[PDB]
A paper describes a structure:
Spikes interact with the host cell-surface proteins ACE2, neuropilin-1, and serine protease TMPRSS2 to facilitate viral entry into the cells. Most antibodies bind to the receptor-binding domain (RBD) of the S-protein, which can be found either in an upward ACE2 accessible or downward ACE2 inaccessible conformation, and block the interaction with ACE2. Similarly, the first generation ICO-hu23 antibody, isolated here from a convalescent patient, demonstrated similar vulnerabilities with the emergence of different VoC’s, especially Beta and Omicron, which resulted in the loss of binding and virus-neutralizing capacity. The antibody ICO-hu23 showed full protection effect in concentration of 16.48 pM in the CPE assay and represented the most potent SARS-CoV-2 neutralizing antibody in our panel.
Author numbering:
A (entry chain S): 1 to 120
B (entry chain B): 333 to 573
C (entry chain C): 27 to 69, 80 to 143, 165 to 172, 186 to 245, 263 to 380
D (entry chain C): 574 to 620, 641 to 670
E (entry chain T): 3 to 110
F (entry chain C): 961 to 1008
Amino acid sequence: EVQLVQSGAEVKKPGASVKVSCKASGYTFTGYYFHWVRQAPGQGLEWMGWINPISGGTKYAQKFQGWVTMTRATSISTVYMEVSRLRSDDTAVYYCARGHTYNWNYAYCDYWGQGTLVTV
Amino acid sequence: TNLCPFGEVFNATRFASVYAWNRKRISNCVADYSVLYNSASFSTFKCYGVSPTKLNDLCFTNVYADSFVIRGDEVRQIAPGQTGKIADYNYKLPDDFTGCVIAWNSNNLDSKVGGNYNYLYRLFRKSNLKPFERDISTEIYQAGSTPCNGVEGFNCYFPLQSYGFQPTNGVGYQPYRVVVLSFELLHAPATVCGPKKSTNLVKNKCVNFNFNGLTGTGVLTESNKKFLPFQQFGRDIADTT
Amino acid sequence: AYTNSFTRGVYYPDKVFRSSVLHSTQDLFLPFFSNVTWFHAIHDNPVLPFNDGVYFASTEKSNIIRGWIFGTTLDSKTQSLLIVNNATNVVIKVCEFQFCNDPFLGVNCTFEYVSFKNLREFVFKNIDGYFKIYSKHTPINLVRDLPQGFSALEPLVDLPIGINITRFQTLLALHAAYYVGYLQPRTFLLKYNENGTITDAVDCALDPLSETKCTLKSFTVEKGIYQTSNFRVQPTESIVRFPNITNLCPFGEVFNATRFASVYAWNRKRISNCVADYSVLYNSASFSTFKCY
Amino acid sequence: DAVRDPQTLEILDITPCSFGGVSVITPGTNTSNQVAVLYQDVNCTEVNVFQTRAGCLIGAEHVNNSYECDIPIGAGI
Amino acid sequence: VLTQPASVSGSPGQSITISCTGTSSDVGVYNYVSWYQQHPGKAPKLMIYDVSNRPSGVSNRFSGSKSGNTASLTISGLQAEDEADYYCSSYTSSSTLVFGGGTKLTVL
Amino acid sequence: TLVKQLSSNFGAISSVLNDILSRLDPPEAEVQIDRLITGRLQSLQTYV
Ligand SMILES: *[C@@H]1O[C@H](CO)[C@@H](O)[C@H](O)[C@H]1NC(C)=O
Ligand SMILES: *[C@@H]1O[C@H](CO)[C@@H](O)[C@H](O)[C@H]1NC(C)=O
Ligand SMILES: *[C@@H]1O[C@H](CO)[C@@H](O)[C@H](O)[C@H]1NC(C)=O
Ligand SMILES: *[C@@H]1O[C@H](CO)[C@@H](O)[C@H](O)[C@H]1NC(C)=O
Ligand SMILES: *[C@@H]1O[C@H](CO)[C@@H](O)[C@H](O)[C@H]1NC(C)=O
Ligand SMILES: *[C@@H]1O[C@H](CO)[C@@H](O)[C@H](O)[C@H]1NC(C)=O
Ligand SMILES: *[C@@H]1O[C@H](CO)[C@@H](O)[C@H](O)[C@H]1NC(C)=O
C-alpha cells in the first residue's frame, strides 16, 4: 500500500526558509509524480507544483515561481519542498501527494501524506 | 603474448544500462574461451556462425565487447530478427550476426531491496533502431500539436524508464547481466589468436598446413611472387589460395 | 572551375595479390572522365559534402595541404576525425574537437595514433563505420591541372572510428590547388600485369563500347555486333487506390472488454468494413507476446 | 491483365512498360573506337537515326548504294 | 479558481448537493472533475475522479456530475460521518491543476 | 566456365568447403555442404 510520511511541524520567522520532506514507500518511487498542496488554517487547498523523480523535472504554481524549490533523492525515496522568503500568509499545512506520471491531467493528487504544519 | 582483459569486463563491478550500453574494443591477444565455456557459471551461452570449441582454436582480426542489464523474460530478444521493447528501442543485433551472446543470473549482485532505480530502457520512438544505433537522447518526443518545451507533459514523457528489480520477484522478473561478443573479419591479419602453439615449417614435402586458421594440404616451396606489403594472400582462378 | 578527371581515382579494391588477369569488381571509384571541382591555394577551404565517399587530389611543390577533418558539424558537438601531417608526423585523432571558424595551420576521445612536382591522390571512404584511406604519391611535371595518365592507389589505413560522416573540410598551411570528386558504386575491369600492378582499367558505365568491353571481359573487341544489355523504360510516379470509406473497427470493446469467456466456450466476433490501425497496438508495448505467421 | 478501379467502376488495361535488347555495331577497336547502337524491337521514339525492322539504329549513316554484306543487322540490312 | 458554496447543511438520511462552477478553460469540455473529502483534522482523500467515477471503498451514495462549465457532487442518505470539507478540483488550460474554495458540509 | 563455377556459394556461407568445416559443427556444416553439393553436381551435369 502507498505510504507517504512527512517531516514534523515547523515554526519560522518572516524572511526565513523552510524545507519539508516527504518519504515515500509501497510502490515504484520513480514511476509517479509528487504534488505539493498547501492549506492555510481554515482555508481551501492551494496547488504548489509537481516534481518528476526521473531527472528532477518540475513545474510550479505561477504565484510561487522564484521562491519554491522541489527536489528528490531517488536513493532514499524522498521528495523535498523548500519555500524561501516566508511571510505570515505562508502559515499552512503542507501536504505532499502522490499522483500520475503523465503531466497534463486532472485530479493529480491521489494519495496524500499526513501534512506538515508550518507556522510563520 | 598479451591476453584479453576479460577479467575487468565480466568481473566488472559496475554496468551501464541498456540504452547507454558500453563498448570496449579489444584486440591483439591470446584468447582462451574455454575458461568461460567450462566455467559452467552461465545460465545461457549461445552464438551463431561458430561453435565455441571451434572458435577457441581460430584467429580473428577484430572483436568488440558490449554489456548491459536486461530482464529475464526478455533475454531471448538479444538475437537476430527479434521483436519487443529492447529489440525496437534499446538494442538490435544485425541479422547476419557473427558474435557470441552470454547471460547469467545476477540477482545476488545487481538487485537490491526496495527496487534498484539505476538501470533504464528506452520506450518510444518514431522509428526502429538501426544496427548498433545508440540513442542517449532524453529529448521529449512530441506526438501532438501543442509545443513540448522540454517539460514532461500531456505528450510523450521521457523515452527512459527504470526497472524495479525487487529481489522478491520471479525468475523472469530478475536482472540477468549480458555480454555480447562480436567477431568480424577484414583484410587485416588476425590479432586475437587462440592458445595454439606453432611448429617448424618443412619445405618441398607434402604437408598439412595451418597459417592463421587457413588450412589445406600441399607442398610449400619458396617463391618469387612479389606480394605488396599490405597483401597476405594470393589467389587462383578457383578462388583457392 | 572544373576539370577532367580522365582515368584517375583507381585504388586497389582489396589486399589480395593478383597478376596477369582482368578482374571485374564493384566498388566506390571515381567515374572516368567525370568533373571534379577545382579549388585554388594561390593569391579556399570551404566545407564540402562527403556523400558516400570522396576523392581528393592535390598538386604540391611545398606541402601546403596538411590535413583533413571529417564529421557532420565539425564544431565540438560530435566526434570528428582529424588527420594532420605536421612536418614528418602523421597524427590521427577522433576527439570532439573545437575547430576554428576558419580552420588552418600556420607555418571525449576514442582514438589516437602517431607515425607542381608531387601529385598526391587520396581516397576517403566509410563502410559500416570503417574509415578507409588510400593514397598514392607520384612525381609530376605539371602546374596547370591534373596530369593525364593511369596510376593505382594503395591502402594505408583502416580506422574503426564509427563516426557518422556527411561533411568534410581541408587544412591548408599558411605562411597548391586541389580537387574534390565523389565516388560512385561503378563496376571496373581492372588490368593487373605480370607483377600484380594495376596498369589499366575500364569504367563499365562510361559508354557503349566500354559496356561491350566489360561484357566480353576484354580490353579488345573483335569486329561484329554485340548484345550487351537490356533496356527498360523506368516508371515516373505512383498511383494509390483504396475504396473511400471511414468506419473504424471496435477493437476497443474487444481488447478492453470487461468480461471474457472461458476457452471451451471461446467467443467469436466477426468484424468487417473498417479502417484498421494495428500500429496503435503494435507500438503499445503493453503485450508480453505478439507473434503471427 | 486488367483491373476494376475500386473507387470508380471502370476497367483499366495494364500494359507493361516498353523494353528491349541493345546491340552495339562495331568495327574492331584495332581500327576505330567509333560505334553504332541498335535498340532492338522498338520505335525511334522512347529512345543520324535510321528506323529498320530490326529496331532503331543510331549512329550509322544511311546510304543508297548496295554492297556485299559485312556486319549483318537484319531484314536485308 | 472554481467556485463552491462555503456551507451546505442537511439532516441524516436526506440528499444534499454541492455545486462547483468554473469556466471553459477548466470545467467546460474538454475537462474532467475530481472531488476530495477532507474529514476534520485529516488529509484530503479522493472521492470522485473523471466527473462521476468512484475509487474503491467510496459508497454509491456519493455521485458526481458535470454539465457544461459546472459540476455537482450529490450525497444521498446523508450520515454524520459525512461532516467534512469537500473540494472540487479540475484540469485548467491544458497546463495546471486548480481547486474550488471548499464546501463545509454539516450534518444536523 | 566449369572451373569458375566452384567459386559460387549457391547460397552457402562460403564457396570454400574447408571454411565451412573449420567453423561449424557437423549438424550445421551438413546443411551448408548440401547447398554446395547441389550447385556443383548441377554444374558437372551441364558440362557433360
Ligand atoms: C561537367 O561540367 C561541364 C562544364 O564545364 C558541363 O558541360 C558537363 O555537362 C559536366 N558533366 C557532368 C557529367 O557533370
Ligand atoms: C606535431 O604534432 C604533435 C602533437 O600531435 C607534436 O608532438 C609534435 O612535436 C609536432 N611536430 C613535430 C615536427 O614534432
Ligand atoms: C616487373 O618488375 C621488374 C623490375 O623489378 C621489371 O624488369 C619487369 O619488366 C616488370 N614487369 C612488368 C609486367 O612490367
Ligand atoms: C469514392 O468517392 C465518392 C465520393 O466522392 C463516392 O461516390 C464513391 O461511392 C466512393 N467509392 C467507394 C468504393 O466508397
Ligand atoms: C592491330 O594493332 C596493332 C598495334 O597495336 C598492330 O601491330 C597490328 O598490325 C594491328 N592489326 C590489324 C589486323 O589491324
Ligand atoms: C513508330 O511510331 C509512328 C507514330 O509516331 C508510327 O507511324 C510507326 O508505324 C511506328 N513504327 C514502329 C515500327 O513501331
Ligand atoms: C536516295 O536517293 C533518293 C533520290 O532518288 C533520295 O530521296 C533518298 O533520300 C536517298 N536515300 C539515301 C539512303 O541516301
